[PDB]
């Protein structure tokens, strides 16, 4: 189920984003896609994994914010060939500064949504609004992003 929570006692102008999004290190080339898929789809579906081997790491999106707090905890330090796999939060939307990446929960004031964050936010299939207006006091999970802006599809 979409969250869309009134948070009244967050700051004010702000809403809070919950990520979707699960920092990667510590990937050697012995660790690949196929076998890092396997080893997130215990906790839910994967929507995006993506490595990339010449900066040790990678990033891995859910559908789901409650899959991605599970694997976030089981997936924390795992030793693994010649490395360990230590997946922590990471930051899909909204500006990096306003995400702690101790939770990867953000809260943004709404005045630092760019033009293309708002619109994602209101017409995301997983997560954002579900086509509601953004309006503050509101916790919702990390849009998807990086398509086009449009209300037609
Ligand atoms: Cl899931
Ligand atoms: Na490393
Ligand atoms: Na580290």
Not at 66 to 79: C, L, R, Y
Not at 87 to 99: I, M, Q
Request: glycine share 10%; hydrophobic share 35%; aromatic share 10%.
């Amino acid at each position: 189920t979409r969250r869309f929570e009134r948070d009244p006692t967050i700051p004010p102008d702000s809403i809070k984003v919950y990520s979707r999004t699960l920092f990667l290190g510590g990937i050697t080339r012995s660790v690949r896609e196929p076998v890092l898929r396997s080893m997130f789809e215990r906790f839910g579906s994967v929507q995006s994994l993506i490595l990339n081997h010449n900066y040790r790491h990678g990033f891995l999106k859910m559908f789901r914010r409650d899959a991605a707090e599970k694997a976030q905890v089981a997936m924390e330090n795992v030793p693994f060939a010649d490395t360990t796999i230590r997946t922590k939060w990471g930051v899909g939307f909204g500006p990096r500064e306003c995400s702690d990446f101790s939770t990867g929960i953000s809260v943004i004031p709404i005045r630092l949504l760019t033009d293309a964050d708002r619109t994602w936010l209101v017409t995301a299939e997983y997560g954002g609004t579900g086509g509601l207006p953004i309006t503050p006091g509101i916790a919702l999970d990390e849009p998807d992003i990086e398509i086009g802006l449009g209300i037609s599809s």
